[model samples]
Target: NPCEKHSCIAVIDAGSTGSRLHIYSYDTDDTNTPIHIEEIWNKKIKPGFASIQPNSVTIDAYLTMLLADAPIHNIPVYFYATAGMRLLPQSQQKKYYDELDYWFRQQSQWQLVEAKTITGNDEALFDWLAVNYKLDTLKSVQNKSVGVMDMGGASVQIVFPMPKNAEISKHNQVELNIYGQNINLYVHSFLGLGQTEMSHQFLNSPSCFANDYPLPDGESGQGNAPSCKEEVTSLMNSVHKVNQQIQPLLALNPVNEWYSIGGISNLASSQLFHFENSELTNQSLLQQGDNQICHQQWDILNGQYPDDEYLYQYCLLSSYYYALMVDGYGINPNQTIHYIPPEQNLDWTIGVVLHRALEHHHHHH
Candidate 1:
C-alpha cells in the first residue's frame, strides 16, 4: 500500500493584542523551500475572555469566525497561545484547554489538532529562528556573536547566540539550522512591561496619584501631566533588567551588534526620527530614548497634533502591512517578495503637505 501525502499546516498565534492565522504548504524536501503556498485567511480581534476570563468562549469565537470565513480541510492545525493565555488563572486556563481539546476531538477529520501555550523560552527560540533563518543574518555573524531583543505587547525577550558552532541547545534547546550544527542562543524574558502595563504605570504614578483634579475613574490628570516621567523611568528599568539578564552571555560572546523585532521594533524607526530632531545626541539616548520619546510623541502628537498623528499612523500601518506579508511568505529579508500589496502613496503626499504647510506658516510669521 502506498502512503498518503500529508496536507499543509496552519499556525494560529493567539497573542495579547490580537490573533493571527498563518497557513503554509508542507514540504518534505529538506533542501527545497516550503513553497509558502498562501495565507488562506487573516483577521484581528480584540482578545476577549482569553485576556481575562480565559474560557472556551474566547477560543470558540475565534475558531468559529476563522472556520466560517476560511475553508476547513483535513490539514493539521498548530495552535499557539502567547502572553494572555499563559498568564490566565489556573481554573480559567484549564477550562479553555479542556474545551479546545474537546472541540478538536469532535472534529476528528482534522489531522494533528493540538494547542500549546508557549513559554517565554519558546518565544525566544522561535524569534531566534526567524532572525537567523528568515532574516539570514546568521552568516553575517559567523565569527562574531549577535543579540536579539524582541519586545512583544506583554513581555520582552533578549537572546545572545554564540559563534556558529557553539552548542547551547543541549541545555534544553535544539538547533534550527538545516544541518543542526549552529546551536547557541542564551535567552531571557521580562514579564509585565508591555504597552498595557506601561500605560497603567503612567496613570498611577505618584504625580498622577496625588493630583487634586476630579479626573474620571481610571483616567490620568491632564495632557501635560508629569506622571509620565515615572513610567518612562520604569520602562527604562525594564530594559535594564533585560540587559542585565543577558550580560553574562554578552561577556562570553562580546558582540555589541543588536537586532530587534516585534511591536517594539516597529516603534524604533519613529523613535530614531525623534532622536534626530532632538538636541540630545547621547548614544544611550538613541538606544533608550527612542522607545520612550517615540511613545510620548505618539501620545502627544495624537492628542495635540491630529494632522501629524494621522500621517504617522498611516506610515506605521503601512509598515505593519508589509511586515506581515514578508513574514507570511517565510522569505528571507535578503530576497524580495514582490506580490504583496505595496504601501499607498498617501504617506509621501502627507509628508509633502506637512513640509509645505510648515514652510508657509513660518514664512508668514
Candidate 2:
C-alpha cells in the first residue's frame, strides 16, 4: 500500500539584521492542484546571526536557547544566511558557516540544515514568492499583480511578475515554479543603494541641509524641505531613466531605522495624518510621532525613542526613501504599503521551505 502524509517543517532565517525561526506544516496530498500551507509558530532572535564570530559561544547558546521549546522531532530544518553574511570576507564567512554546519550535523535532535549564504537575487525571488503566496493569489493562472521591493542596509531589491514580451537580460530572469505553475520573475538587487549607504552620501551633501553647510555637491535648495525633495527626486529620475518598465511595487519591506518612514515620509506637510486616534493599525501606517512631537521634542523625550540615535536625519531618510519608492520603483504614494506585517514577517525562509516542499512532492509523484 502506498501512503502519503503531511509534515511540519522548520525554517531558520539567519538574516543580517536579525534571525528568526518559523515552523509550518503542509500536506503532501493535494485535494486539488494547490498545496495548502498553514503557519504554526514563529520566534525571532536579534543582533543578527552576523553579529557573532565563528564558533562563538554567544551564537551557540542563542541558537540552543531559541530551539529549547521548538518541536524538532522528525522535522527537517533549513538554515540560510542573507545580506549580513554577504558583507564578510569569504574566508571569515566560511569559518562561521563551517562551525554551525558541523555542530548541527552532530549535535541536535532536529535534522541539521547546512549553513549557506543566499544571493540577493534569490532572496528577492523568495520575497516575491512569499508576498504572492501570502496574498493568496499565487495559485491563480493570471499574472500576479503585485511587486515587492525591500530596502535594507546595503542594497534594495525589486521583484515582480515578468512581462510577457519583456526580453530582460539573463541576469534578471528567474524561472519560479509554484503550485504547478511556472512564473518567470524579474528580480534584481540594486547594490550600494540601501538606506544606510545612501544616508552616508547625504551626510556630506550640502543639498540636504537648510542653511547650506557648504558640504559637497555644491547644489543647495532655498527651503530645507525643497532641497530634500529635490534630492530624492534626482535619485528617482536616475532609476526611471534606466528601466522604462518599472512596476507598481505593491509591497515594500520596512528594512532599517527609517522603518515606518516608508509610509508617511513623502506626504505633504498638510496631508500627513499619523497622529490620529488609534484608527491606523497597519504597522506601516503608524506614527512619525507626528506634529505634536517636533524635531526638538524628539531629543527632549529622546530616551523614549527606540533608536536613541534616531534624530532629525528624519528629513534625509524620508527624502531618500521617497525617491527610492516613487522615483526609482514607480510606486504611487496613494497606494498603501505594508512595511513589516503586523502579524508576521515577510521572510525569504518561508519561500525557500515552501519551494522545496512543492518540488519534493512533484519529483516523487
Write down the RMSD of all candidates, one decimal each.
15.0, 7.1
Clashing pairs in 2: none
Query: What lDDT does the true structure give each of the candidates?
Result: 0.44, 0.57
Which digits, one per residue and each the tens of the lDDT, describe model 2 over residues 1-365?
A: 01124567778877756778887776644623225666677888876687776665766776776666775445777788777788788998888877776667656467765568878887787777676667676776763246666666666677766543345567676775566677867778766666665666666554444333334555542224345645656655654341344543223222211122112222212123352322222222212322222222323333444442334444455556556665565555444554543234556655776666555546663
Candidate 1 residue pairs in backbone clash: none
Model 1, 1-365: lDDT tens per residue? Answer: 01134335556666676666654443333434332223444544566326634456666666666544645556666666767676677787788778877767766555645576767666666655545443355334365455554556666555666544354444424344332244656665556654444344444332322222223465433322222333354354444453334444455666434445554323333423342321221233222332333234344444554433222332222222222222211213332211111121000111111112222334553
Report the C-alpha displacement of residue 288, candidate 2, in angstroms.
7.6
Candidate 1 minimal-lDDT segment of 10 residues: 344-353
Judged by whole-model lDDT over C-alpha atoms, candidate 1 comes out at 0.44
Top-TM-score candidate index:
2
| lDDT for position 62 in model 2 | 69
